[PDB]
Ligand binder design. Structure first.
Ligand code: NI
Length: 341
């Protein structure tokens, strides 16, 4: 049974609602981005129209084998008519192909669904500037003041410098970066660029990266692992056991591993500056946890919402406990009283 916060009132539309079977009255299923919690339920046997970005469409076709006739890609920043309702897709600053959706209801109501997003001041000069939003369906993943983390630029700077230093000291070292989904590709692409290397990876991961419309991608990645000094591995293998085993595999070409686990927030954010971050070390292996977020900080979320001044807010994350829901409602009221809407 589909929950209320995935329904768009006064339309036949749902958002990210693929795990409930056939939804009663739904004529179009929107998908905000290609992350499993959101696509959960789609497969090659789906026969309803799916509306999404070009990138999300490339992934549905190639990775999930959804048939072409049910995939409806829309350009960004463009007024489109779907089943007689005007819609716009906006970049969400999340993972590749992730969108926010603006719906202009036939009765005059305007609704923004953020999907997953990392709010940014640049969004204040999109097509959002032009008119009023009555309802906001908000990605509230980090809606609490304890959730602080640095910009994505500062995090990339720390990784580039760390990696370049280590490999310049030891030309026989290997950099490994963990992944479990699309997103956060800048981590491994920036490190490989500074080292003058391609990024090596499995055939399955190469196929995923080939769907993302990244410029010059053929110049950046490869399946020939041993030609490369940046490798990608599944996130679950980024530990001393998994990396010991990986170090065997190149035929003793490498005598040191430096590894990155991009997480979201961890409690070490409440005490440690990014510059001050230190790895866990065992012998010739070091693992760095780095706070590369593709969701809004509390401060970024507050700024966006105070700027948008919506009439109602519906959270889409952390909605399962009464304590969570109560905490989020208190912050929405402070923000409104502080700004005066
Ligand atoms: Ni996501």
């Amino acid at each position: 049974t589909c929950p209320f916060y995935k329904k768009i009132p006064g339309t036949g539309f749902t958002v990210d609602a693929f795990q409930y079977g056939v939804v009663e009255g739904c004529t179009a299923y929107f998908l905000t981005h290609f992350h499993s919690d959101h696509y959960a339920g789609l497969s090659k046997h789906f026969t309803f129209p799916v509306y999404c970005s070009e990138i999300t469409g490339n992934l549905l076709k190639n990775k999930l084998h959804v048939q072409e006739q049910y995939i409806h890609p829309l350009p960004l920043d463009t007024e489109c008519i779907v089943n007689g309702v005007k819609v716009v897709l906006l970049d969400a600053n999340h993972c590749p192909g992730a969108v926010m959706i603006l719906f202009y209801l036939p009765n005059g109501t305007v609704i923004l669904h953020t999907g997953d997003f990392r709010a940014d001041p640049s969004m204040e000069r999109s097509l959002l500037a032009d008119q009023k939003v009555h309802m906001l369906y908000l990605d509230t993943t980090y809606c609490s003041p304890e959730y602080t983390f640095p910009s994505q630029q500062e995090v990339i700077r720390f990784a580039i410098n760390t990696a370049f230093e280590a490999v310049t000291l030891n030309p026989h070292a290997l950099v490994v970066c963990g992944t479990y989904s699309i997103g956060k590709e800048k981590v491994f692409l920036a490190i490989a660029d500074v080292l003058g290397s391609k990024v090596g990876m499995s055939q399955e991961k190469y196929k995923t990266l080939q769907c993302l419309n990244i410029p010059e991608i053929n110049s950046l990645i490869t399946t020939d692992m041993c030609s490369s000094l940046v490798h990608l591995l599944p996130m679950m293998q980024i530990n001393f056991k998994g990396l010991q085993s990986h170090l065997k595999k190149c035929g003793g070409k490498y005598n040191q591993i430096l590894a990155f686990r991009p997480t979201g927030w961890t409690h070490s954010n409440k005490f440690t500056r990014i510059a001050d971050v230190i790895p866990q070390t065992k012998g010739n292996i070091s693992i760095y946890g780095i706070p590369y977020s593709e969701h809004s900080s509390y401060l970024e979320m507050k700024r966006f919402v105070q700027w948008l001044k919506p009439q109602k807010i519906i959270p889409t994350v952390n909605v399962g406990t009464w304590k969570s829901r109560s905490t989020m409602e208190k912050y929405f009221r402070e923000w409104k009283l502080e700004a005066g809407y």
